[PDB]
Amino acid sequence: AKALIVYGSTTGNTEYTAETIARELADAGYEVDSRDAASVEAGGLFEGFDLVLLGCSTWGDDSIELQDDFIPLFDSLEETGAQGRKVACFGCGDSSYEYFCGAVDAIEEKLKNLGAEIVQDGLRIDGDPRAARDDIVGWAHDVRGAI
Ligand SMILES: Cc1cc2nc3c(=O)[nH]c(=O)nc-3n(C[C@H](O)[C@H](O)[C@H](O)COP(=O)(O)O)c2cc1C
């Protein structure tokens, strides 16, 4: 399996999360490409992968705002080759906000409309992901077992 992990992270939390998932798929024998959203170009980005994992933190407080580097990508999602692709989403947030990881929910909804296949319910981390490392390892294992 070739897996691509694309993340948006402003304070490094979602990035730490992505690195952790990368390592677990890599340890498992997958070939893993991990890229910060700041640096990708959307056209045909998902072509050639068996699994695509998209990570993004939630901002805005009063409304949902995706992490900044991720916006350009989200906007161009239909140009990715997501139709019929196996995907799963993850993200960091804080449950004291009214839309707790709303970024995850928007990205899943859009992926569904494009015809991607969501292989597992998204990983929504509340707080410091270093305190939820077992939950992240756990999710990475359930995704592998679903493709
Ligand atoms: C000003 C502000 C607004 C935030 N707004 C939201 C929000 O609407 N929903 C949410 O779940 N988390 C929200 N969070 C918390 C971040 O998503 C959380 O800190 C996450 O760990 C940051 O991830 P990152 O470093 O990868 O960008 C906010 C944080 C700040 C400081």
From Swiss-Prot:
Molecular function in Gene Ontology: electron transfer activity; FMN binding
Gene3D superfamilies: 3.40.50.360
Keyword Transport found: yes
InterPro entries named among the record's database cross-references: Flav_short (IPR010087), Flavdoxin-like (IPR001094), Flavodoxin (IPR050619), Flavodoxin/NO_synth (IPR008254), Flavodoxin_CS (IPR001226), Flavoprotein-like_sf (IPR029039)
Keywords noted in UniProt: Electron transport, Flavoprotein, FMN, Transport
Coiled-coil positions: none
Flavodoxin-like domain boundaries: 3-144
Cofactor(s) the record lists: FMN
NCBIfam families the UniProt entry points to: flav_short (TIGR01753)
Protein's job: Low-potential electron donor to a number of redox enzymes.
Family: Belongs to the flavodoxin family.
Name by which UniProt lists this protein: Flavodoxin
